[PDB]
Structure 1
Amino acid sequence: LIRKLPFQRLVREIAQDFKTDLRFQSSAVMALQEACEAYLVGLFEDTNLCAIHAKRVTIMPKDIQLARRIRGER
């Protein structure tokens, strides 16, 4: 769902904060992407319930923030 090359570049860009000139095995990036897509999809499910519960069909930033607050991510 996310385009592969701009996800590679996002991974590299993040990693440089921890160790310069790391290398990533091709299978390691796909394992990160497949976990991120599965994480975002699974969070949007939980936000959609937060909108629907507030009688809103349209998800809103406070729906992300309620989902994460109850999942204990914040």
Structure 2
Amino acid sequence: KPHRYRPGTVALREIRRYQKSTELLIRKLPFQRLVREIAQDFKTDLRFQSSAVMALQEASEAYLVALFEDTNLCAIHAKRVTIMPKDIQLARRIRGERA
């Protein structure tokens, strides 16, 4: 009587749902707290425009989505469908960001 789907179908459904949407996936306030925490180690008592934190979030989510794109290509290349930190490290290494 209780209905349950296979894993692949809800996974692909979420892939479609979030590749159609445009909204920011990281929540606004914990990202803002992360930004203030990282900023704290450069100068005390820093202030931020709201559009500055929104710009940080737009670029950060776009960067991680391109990163997961390359990570998925690394996984698929290695005959897997599950991404691994191996795949993230390979992606960042080929992109030249390992520093």
TM-score range for the pair, normalised by the shorter chain length: over 0.9
Q: Residues 4-59 of structure 1: CA distance to partner in whole angstroms, max 9, x if unpaired?
A: 00000000000010000010011100000000000000000001010000100100
The structural deviation recorded for 1:60 is 0.5
Q: Please, which runs of 5 or more residues in structure 2 have no aligned partner? A: 1-24
- How many residue pairs align between the two structures? 74
TM-score, with normalisation over the residues of structure 1?
0.98
Please state if 1:32 is matched with 2:56: yes
Task: Using CA pairs under 8 Å that are at least 6 residues apart, name the structure with larger relative contact order, 1 or 2.
Answer: 1
3-state secondary structure, aligned to 1:19: coil
3-state secondary structure, aligned to 1:21: coil
The structural deviation recorded for 1:72 is 0.2
C-alpha distance in 2 between matches for 1:51 and 1:22: 40
TM-score, with normalisation over the residues of structure 2?
0.74
Consecutive aligned runs of 4 or more in structure 1 exceeding 4 Å deviation: none
The structural deviation recorded for 1:66 is 0.2
